[model samples]
Every structure is written in C-alpha cells, then in structure tokens.
Target: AVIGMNEAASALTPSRVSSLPDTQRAAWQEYLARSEAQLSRDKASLAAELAPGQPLPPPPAEGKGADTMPLDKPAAWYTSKAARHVADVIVSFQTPAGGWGKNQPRDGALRLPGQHYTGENVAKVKRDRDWHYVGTIDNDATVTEIRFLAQVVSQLAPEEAAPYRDAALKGIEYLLASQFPNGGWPQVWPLEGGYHDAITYNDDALVHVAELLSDIAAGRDGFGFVPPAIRTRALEATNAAIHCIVETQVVQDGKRLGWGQQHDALTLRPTSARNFEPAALSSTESARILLFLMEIEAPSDAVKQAIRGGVAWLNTSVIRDQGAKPLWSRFYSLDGNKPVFGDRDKTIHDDVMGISQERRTGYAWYTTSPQKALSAFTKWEKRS
Candidate 1:
C-alpha cells in the first residue's frame, strides 16, 4: 500500500524548507509522492494476484493441536531458509509502527509473489504503513513478532540480520514507550482514547507485557541481544507494574478479592470495556494475574499476601450447588457478588441461558481458569 509520506511532508514550515538545498528537497518530495503512489498500486496488484476464486491454502500446523503457536520451540525450528522466507513475509506485514495486525496469516504463504523476500522489501516497511495507527499489546500481538524476529536474527550473518534486529529493537521500544507512568499498558497505544486507554489486563494485556519485559530483564529465552540499559529499564518497568497489580486487587467489606479484566488507569477501579464486558470481578483474568505474580523471583511479602488473597477469592467465588461441576462464571456482579451475563444490548441477566443463542454458544460464560489458579497456588505456596 502507498505510504502517505508526501502529503505528510507537505505541511513542513517555510523555515524548515528554506534550510534544504532546492534540488535535494525537490527530489525528496518527488520520491515520497512516487513511493506513496507505488504502494497504492502494490496493494491493488497483490490483491488481484490472490483473487477470490483461488483456493485458500490449508491451515498451518497447530502447536499442540490447540490452534496455538508454540512459543517455547527452539530457534532452529524457525531458522531454515524456508523459515527465513516466512520471517520476510511477516516483516512485510509488520505495521509501520513496528507491530502487526492481529488474527492474520503467519505460515508464510505467497501473498506478494517473488518480490516478498530478500530483505530489500523491509526498507519499504514504514511506520503506520498499514494505517491502523494503534499498536497493541493485546491478543499476543507485538511481543510475539519481536521474539520471532530475534530468533531469526540469532541465525543470520550480521549484514543479513541487521534489518530484522533493528525491527525487533524498534518493537521493543514501542513496548517500553507505551507503558503508562503507573506501570500499566493500555490495550492499544499511541493512545487511542476511551476504554482502550484503560490499564488492560483483559486477555492478559499487562501480563503479556510483563512477561516480555521479564524475559528481556533476565536475558533468558530469545532476548540475548537486549542492551544492558534496556534490561535495566525492563526490570524497573516490571517492578513498578507488579506494585500496580498488587494495588489493584479487588476488595469488598474488608475482604480481599481477585482482579477485574480492566481498570481505570487513574483510579485503579474496575471498569467496563467491550459491550458485553462490564466492570466486575473477572475469574479468567484474576487467575491469570495470580499466575503472572507467581513468576517473580523472591516475591515481596506484599506480593505473597496478594497471591494468598487472590487464591482465597478464587475458592470463595466458585459457582457451586447450582452447577454440575465446580467452575467459575466469566463475570461476577460488582454489587452483589454473583455470576452475571450480558447480552448484545448490554443488558445484564441472571442466567447464562437468558442471553441470546449466539452469545450463549460463542462466548465462554463459565471458565476453569480459577480452578487452574487453585491448582497452581498449592505449588506456589510450597515454594516458601
């Protein structure tokens, strides 16, 4: 797609323009316009090349037959000539802001024909190149790309590896810069306002950011190239975020509770997000928060207390007596401490079956996440 660099530069002040020599400035402007136009043609051409009638390629192999990518696999699993080619494909799809669009292809199919590989196309990759200006930490998005590229870089010649390494660094910077002063991350960054700007833990947004930083801080896994200064920053950011998690743990009538999926960054209060997602105690996210807190080494006494409080809430919150198996509802009423459901109209209902059929079958109204936390908590306690 055509990058809009020319129209963007057209707003340059007269003083700024006067500093550049006439010929050089004019050539630069011309190049921007040409590149912008060329991107337009490329978008159309690429779309036509993979016309609608063509049979779509078969699905990529599952990580564990769970439709997930295996993150812990070795770099060699991704370092082959074929693998490097896939990295090139991923690089092209990367947003100009150094992240990627979610829920797209990752198997390195031929969407761009012969021109896709060979590293030269990376130069054409520019910020906001895809124009979905909000880079995100949600949905296992940017961090996964950064890790994958780092793995690819570890295997390449320095000259050939530079682009991917640079991209991974830029992505890392995006993650660092997007962190809020309170050591939380919004679901989207370059800060799109509204609930997106909340300090999101839903779908483990803050947890994912913390895990990535933790890897960089420890120089573990695929993060060996992170500079010392960045590693220091990673540790500092993660430490602050841990405090935020502790402070945001829900409480009612002097009894400690678990976490909500999202919170107001300023107030640290539980907050609503999507239409169906209301401000309430979230079993899934609270369980995930416990698991993340347990990842810290030499956890503080406050952290342990927070963990203990969370485990107690998980036990107390279980949907019992009325259910066939011990499970937790996805959401709990903030006022009454009972399981609740929301329909498309944002109306709350007492019964899961009261919601529309689509929402009933499509969404998980109950979860085993708290059960997972309870199991993990026993091991977490034994560590003491």
Candidate 2:
C-alpha cells in the first residue's frame, strides 16, 4: 500500500521528514506515475568475443565494475585515463528517467543503439526481461552509479563534470522519482511486481541507498559535486527511507525485533521475498541496520529506541554453540522467536538442517555479522 506521506511526516519530524523541500515532489510523482505505462508489453524491449555478432567485445563484465567503478582507490585515480573512459560508459547506460539497471557491468562496451539497459544475463539467470529493473536501486544499482559519477565529477572541471554531473542529477531524480511516496524503497523501479515491488531490505538495499543519498544530501564524502539544487531532495529522500526504517521494524507481542527481507508494498508489514525467504524477522539485516542507525549524529526518540530494541534482541538471540563465534540465524519466527529456515519446497522450519540442500547452501541460514553491531552498540549506548 502506498503510505500516506503524512504518516512519515509525523513520525520522523524534520529528521523523519518535512524539513527538506519537496520542491520537485510533484515532478517526481508525475514521473513515477507514468512509469507503470512502460509495462503491458514486457521481450518488449548485449555482447560477445569475436567478429560480426560472432563476438568481439565480450559480454560486459557482470556485477560491479572492479577498477572502472572502484569503491576505494588512490585519490589520484578518479581521473585516470582508463577510469574516465568507463565513467562515460557508465553515464551512457542511465535511463532517460535517471536510475541504472542491475547486474550489468560498466567496464565494457558502451550500451549499443536500440539496446535495452539490462545485461542479457539478468534475463537468462534471473528470469526477468529487459523491461524489468530498468531503473532499479536493488543492491548497488542506481546508488553505486551515482556515487561513482560523483567521484568522477568531483575531480573534473565544470566543463568536464557536465556529463557525469548531469547524469548524476538525473539518477538522483530517479530515486526521488521512484520513491514509494510513503518513504519506502522497492528493489526495482518503473515498479515491478511481487518481491521486487516490496520495500526491500534484501542485501542491505535500503541502507545502502539511504546512506549514499545521506552523503549527497549533506555534501560530504565524495558527493560534493552533487550541487545544492538537489541536496534538499536527497535529504528528503534519505529521511523518507529512514522514516520507513523506523516504521517497518517488526513488532510482535509489543516487542520490537528487527525487519523482514521484504515488506508489503502498501502497508509496510513484513512480507516475503523468495519462497524460501519467508516473512519473518531477519537479524543479519537487523544487525547491519543497527550500525547504520547509530551513525545518525542526532537520532530521534524513535531512532534511539530502535537501536535499543534491536540491540537487546540481537544480544538475546545469540546462537553461541553453532560456531566458535557468537552467531545469528538469518531469520527468526516473528511470533515465538524460533529460528526460521526456508526451503525451495515452500516449507518453513525451525531447524536449519532440514531444508533442501540447494537452499541450505544457497541462502545464508546463519551470520556472524551481528557481532559487529553488538560491539558497536557498546559505545553508542554509553553515549546514550
């Protein structure tokens, strides 16, 4: 359900919401409104290693570009001769509406004429088509692209920065454009159905987006090139994501635990993702969430309690015997807090050992990452 913007406004305050101008809110809304029209004809929209469609260029590298879209590098490298060429390729793949697609790599040939923006592998492997994920924020899709562009442009002169910066601006617009209006973020935009449409917490998608937009909004890190005009929108969008974070934390028996892998699009209730990924409390996600929540320089009462509740739950839910390290189930029952496990057969279990071999190995049943959040909370709690 599309949440009432007024709800986020009330819970988040200026921090949760309302402080940043919704200057282009209408424009963003209009853009998203029309995106659904791209559907109704989903074949309705890549490369090789030889000669004449025989394969010369090789398929664009799958997943994140290593050197071309490097997350960390020497300060001098952003404008490197090789790095700059791919930056243009990165700019080229952006959809006219802003936002990049998932799974395609930036290190290879520029997107070709009449070519759809997604990688061929996305359709083959993920079983979705060109029309899907056109402007996704899943994993690091649009968010990563914008940051890479910001880093590139930061090192360039005004004239040189134009292309990357212009692209970055449109990408920023895409986030706001596709925003759930209730402050939630779905995994894909131009809005797909089922799990893709949920306010996804998968792979830490929401946190990644909020933080990147947070940096852009504040003009820090390498996002200084994002310009003041859109900083307000970035701030507004970040808080909307933040507001949704607080809104969606699972509460059962009056006790808050964590979040589900996905939530119902309209209502924000914990929802299912893959068949094996049921609607249940997900601690690895919660663990990562706690660390990000604490990053808030001035967390609100809601934010503070969110940290407290989450820390209490993670500490209480420890699975110390499973490994040498203290560990956590990737999921837990929302009602009784039993560790929840999923299988491809659409079965849910309390014992991880029972799931099909495929899902057991394919999906994470346990994680030690929560260990970090518990430790970080020690310092944050001391201050609180």
- lDDT values for all models: 0.68, 0.72
Candidate 1 Cα outliers beyond 4 Å, as residue runs: 1-70, 109-133, 157-159, 321-325
- State residue 118's C-alpha deviation in candidate 1, in Å: 22
Write candidate 2's Cα lDDT for 138-224 as tens digits: 757888888888877777777877888888888888777667767878787776655787787788888888898898889976677
In angstroms, give how far residue 40 of model 2 lies from its true place.
8.5
Cα displacement (angstroms), candidate 2, residue 69, comes to 1.3
